[PDB]
Amino acid sequence: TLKFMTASSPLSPKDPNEKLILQRLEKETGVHIDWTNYQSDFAEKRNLDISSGDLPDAIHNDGASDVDLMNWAKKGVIIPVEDLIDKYMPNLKKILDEKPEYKALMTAPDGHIYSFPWIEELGDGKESIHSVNDMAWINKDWLKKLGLEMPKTTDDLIKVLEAFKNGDPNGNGEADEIPFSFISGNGNEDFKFLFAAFGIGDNDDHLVVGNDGKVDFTADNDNYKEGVKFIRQLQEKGLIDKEAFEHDWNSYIAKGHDQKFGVYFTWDKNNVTGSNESYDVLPVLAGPSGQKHVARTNGMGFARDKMVITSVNKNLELTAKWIDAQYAPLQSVQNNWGTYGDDKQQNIFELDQASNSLKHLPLNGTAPAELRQKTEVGGPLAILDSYYGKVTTMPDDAKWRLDLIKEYYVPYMSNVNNYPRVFMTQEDLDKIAHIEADMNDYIYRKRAEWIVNGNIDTEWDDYKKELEKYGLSDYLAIKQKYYDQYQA
Ligand SMILES: OC[C@H]1O[C@@](CO)(OC[C@@]2(OC[C@@]3(O[C@H]4O[C@H](CO)[C@@H](O)[C@H](O)[C@H]4O)O[C@H](CO)[C@@H](O)[C@@H]3O)O[C@H](CO)[C@@H](O)[C@@H]2O)[C@@H](O)[C@@H]1O
Ligand SMILES: [Ca+2]
Ligand SMILES: [Ca+2]
């Protein structure tokens, strides 16, 4: 018996032990987990537990930031685990011996390892499945219906959206068409993907790496100004979803499912407009001066912390062995993606007993993300490029996305490098975190304000000064420092 805090989807059972995977796991391991399972606001609820001294044995599927992780280590909330890996975790050792770069990625600059990672190999470099998150999707049915060609430029896009607005492409005599929509902020449904059509573009870090080796701050660039102006034009012309700055995922996908969107953003259309050929990828567009670019995210198939062990943990050896069971290939694949042989609900896999390998089943039009979030576990695991065809099939939705990324975006990803996943010192993390406490929401708040009020030209210099007062220069110097050490 161990006590784990975890994070899961609101679609999944309130008690994680209702998951088929965890049932089978308790049989296999003989460990029963008592779960504290937060399904909304995990990070905030976790932090209250930590602040009140109400710690589990370990926090599963945690996803803490680096600053959190180091703060917790310094205050003795969590423990270093490297001795536990050496002594009790042969599955993990195997992985780290085959792919030693993950060990580097796990290790803090004080020399300790504080967390167990998630590793999922799907594409490399520019071809990473993570290279673009908020892909743009377009209603090709409407285009074909209105006699329109796929737009090639930002100007074409405006015209297409105007025709969507006024042209009644769904043919019901109603102005029900929402030409352009998004969910504003970080994440897969934001519009920042289009900013690159004005050069450089933007990502959730607001940080790219120039081909000069200089870290660039995106959200102060004239190019970024132009991107905001473009979205403002869309606003002024009545082409943006009237609730874009208010709605949520559930509302976004309700409209999606009714196919109200002309152009919208998401990871995979199948989750929002469904599994049809009405919507396809919006190809990379040329800006007005011929800019044609895809900004790279800094995302990768690695998250440093999907589990930590607290300093109250009862049985370090038992914990460490339980965790290592998650790194066995079959377990890792399932924990990540779902399972087989549920006699009562849909299954992501079938187990082929002849090979003892997993195989992706077709979904009867069920959303990718929907069944997954019900049946996955998250937590620490590894899926290596050598598992495909031997331990498991590659997901078809993954393969498909990798193809799209390679076909539509890679040619226009002209930045040789993105920002590497460094592990900064505690002091530097703390410094950075203070700065981001000001910048982060300020950056989104002004972006939205300018789209809605049209005053970017008169507020831009003052916004840049404000960003300097928050410490943007110190922030960049720190970023650049770690990028330079990484390259050396
Ligand atoms: O294209 C399919 C392949 O893409 C991957 C890339 O890792 O999976 C992406 C995918 O699932 C991610 C998932 O979790 C994310 O969203 C959570 C909700 O906030 C968040 O807690 C996780 O930390 C974050 O990783 O999203 C779904 C739904 O939440 C969940 O079940 C997943 O763990 O993203 C799309 C939805 O945004 C999904 O369609 C897709 O699975 C790779 O795993 C896939 O093979
Ligand atoms: Ca209509
Ligand atoms: Ca800049």
From Swiss-Prot:
The keyword Aminoacyl-tRNA synthetase does not apply. Ca(2+) 2 binds at residues 216-217, 220-221. Ca(2+) 1 binds at residues 168, 170, 172, 174, 176-177. GO terms for molecular function: metal ion binding. The keyword Kinase does not apply. Changing residue 130 to A: 2-fold decrease in fructooligosaccharide (FOS) binding compared to the wild-type. Impaired growth on nystose. GO terms for cellular component: plasma membrane. Substrate binds at residues 120, 188, 267, 271, 306, 337, 372, 376. Changing residue 337 to A: Significant decrease in fructooligosaccharide (FOS) binding. Impaired growth on nystose. Its main location: membrane. InterPro entries: Bact_solute-bd_prot1. PANTHER family: ABC TRANSPORTER SOLUTE BINDING PROTEIN-SUGAR TRANSPORT (PTHR43649:SF17), ARABINOSE-BINDING PROTEIN-RELATED (PTHR43649). The calcium-binding site is essential for the translocation of fructooligosaccharide (FOS) substrates by the transporter. Belongs to the bacterial solute-binding protein 1 family. This is Fructooligosaccharide ABC transporter substrate-binding protein FusA. It comes from Streptococcus pneumoniae serotype 4 (strain ATCC BAA-334 / TIGR4). The lineage of its organism: Bacteria, Bacillati, Bacillota, Bacilli, Lactobacillales. The gene is fusA.
